[PDB]
From Swiss-Prot:
It comes from the Eukaryota. It is linked to Cornelia de Lange syndrome 6: A form of Cornelia de Lange syndrome, a clinically heterogeneous developmental disorder associated with malformations affecting multiple systems. It is characterized by facial dysmorphisms, abnormal hands and feet, growth delay, cognitive retardation, hirsutism, gastroesophageal dysfunction and cardiac, ophthalmologic and genitourinary anomalies. CDLS6 inheritance is autosomal dominant. This is Bromodomain-containing protein 4. JQ1, a thieno-triazolo-1,4-diazepine derivative, and I-BET, a benzodiazepine derivative, have been tested on tumors with success. Treatment with GSK1210151A (I-BET151, a I-BET derivative) has strong effets on mixed lineage leukemia and promotes myeloid differentiation and leukemia stem-cell depletion. Interacts with p53/TP53; the interaction is direct. Interacts (via CTD region) with CDK9 and CCNT1, acting as an associated component of P-TEFb complex. Interacts with RELA (when acetylated at 'Lys-310'). Interacts (via NET domain) with NSD3, CHD4, BICRA and ATAD5. The interaction with BICRA bridges BRD4 to the GBAF complex. Interacts (via NET domain) with JMJD6 (via JmjC and N-terminal domains); the interaction is stronger in presence of ssRNA and recruits JMJD6 on distal enhancers. Interacts with NSD3. Interacts with NIPBL. Residues 12-117 form the Bromo domain. Belongs to the BET family. The chain holds residues 43 to 165 of 1362 of the full protein.
Amino acid sequence: TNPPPPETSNPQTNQLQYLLRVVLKTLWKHQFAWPFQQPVDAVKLNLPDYYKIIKTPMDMGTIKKRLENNYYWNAQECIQDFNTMFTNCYIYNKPGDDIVLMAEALEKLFLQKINELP
Ligand SMILES: COc1ccc(OC)c(/C=C/C(=O)c2cc(OC)c(OC)cc2CCNC(C)=O)c1
Ligand SMILES: [Cl-]
């Protein structure tokens, strides 16, 4: 069985609104977005070692749930989750894999969207 997804509720800056409404939304509609739209389903994908290697898992779906529930206090905490998501992919998969190239293309576009923020 897969581990439970990361918590998405803690209990509104302009940069957080921008990350959700502009950065995340554009990356969510990118063609290479599908493997990162929800937590890695290690059971269905038959990856019994994923959650042994990746100890801080993260996906765009959990970012959205966190951005919609005001989980983050600031934009830096949210930007770290994206970097957690990208670096997780680089750690588990092998260089040259198509998913690694997809993650690189997503990150390089992510740095452009955050390169112009309030
Ligand atoms: C029906 O097939 C489906 C349907 C829905 C899916 O997700 C919604 C997926 C997810 C596939 C992957 O995630 C995936 C894809 C790879 O190449 C394409 C890969 O190459 C080594 C390693 C992984 C393992 C995860 N590695 C990560 C996340 O970095 C597959
Ligand atoms: Cl808060």
